[PDB]
Amino acid sequence: VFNATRFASVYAWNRKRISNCVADYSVLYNSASFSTFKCYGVSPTKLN
Amino acid sequence: DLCFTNVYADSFVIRGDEVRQIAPGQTGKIADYNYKLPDDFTGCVIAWN
């Protein structure tokens, strides 16, 4: 999803379903590649 | 109009976009690893280019 070569337009935004896997969110929230990382109803650290 | 027992002037330099991280209850590189304000901070934050 994040490393996809080309992205969709906002009006026809793509949706990917995630299921049956282990999500290591550190890989995301510890990366310095994102300008905005805003989490609602959850705290990023707790995601793990 | 106010008195206080002590004042602490904590001085440092950051880049513009990180100024928002110098505030109570913020997250990010600065707020996490460099300088963290308490949730009950009582004071002023001054920044200029």
From Swiss-Prot, chain A:
* Native source species: Severe acute respiratory syndrome coronavirus 2
Primary role: Attaches the virion to the cell membrane by interacting with host receptor, initiating the infection. The major receptor is host ACE2. When S2/S2' has been cleaved, binding to the receptor triggers direct fusion at the cell membrane. When S2/S2' has not been cleaved, binding to the receptor results in internalization of the virus by endocytosis using host TFRC and GRM2 and leading to fusion of the virion membrane with the host endosomal membrane. Alternatively, may use NRP1/NRP2 and integrin as entry receptors.
Effect ascribed to mutating residue 31 to L: In strain: Omicron/BA.1
Spell out where the chain is glycosylated.
3
In terms of the parent sequence, the fragment covers: 341 to 388 of 1273
Q: What is the effect of changing residue 36 to A?
A: In strain: Omicron/BA.2, Omicron/BA.2.12.1, Omicron/BA.4, Omicron/BA.5, Omicron/BQ.1.1, Omicron/XBB.1.5, Omicron/EG.5.1
What do we know about how this protein assembles, alone or with others? Binds to host ACE2. RBD also interacts with the N-linked glycan on 'Asn-90' of ACE2. Cleavage of S generates a polybasic C-terminal sequence on S1 that binds to host Neuropilin-1 (NRP1) and Neuropilin-2 (NRP2) receptors. Interacts with host integrin alpha-5/beta-1 (ITGA5:ITGB1) and with ACE2 in complex with integrin alpha-5/beta-1 (ITGA5:ITGB1). May interact via cytoplasmic c-terminus with M protein. May interact (via N-terminus) with host bilirubin and biliverdin, thereby preventing antibody binding to the SARS-CoV-2 spike NTD via an allosteric mechanism.
Protein name (Swiss-Prot/TrEMBL): Spike protein S1
The reported result of mutating residue 31 to F is:
In strain: Omicron/BA.2, Omicron/BA.2.12.1, Omicron/BA.2.75, Omicron/BA.4, Omicron/BA.5, Omicron/BQ.1.1, Omicron/XBB.1.5, Omicron/EG.5.1
Q: What is the effect of changing residue 3 to Q?
A: Reduced viral infectivity
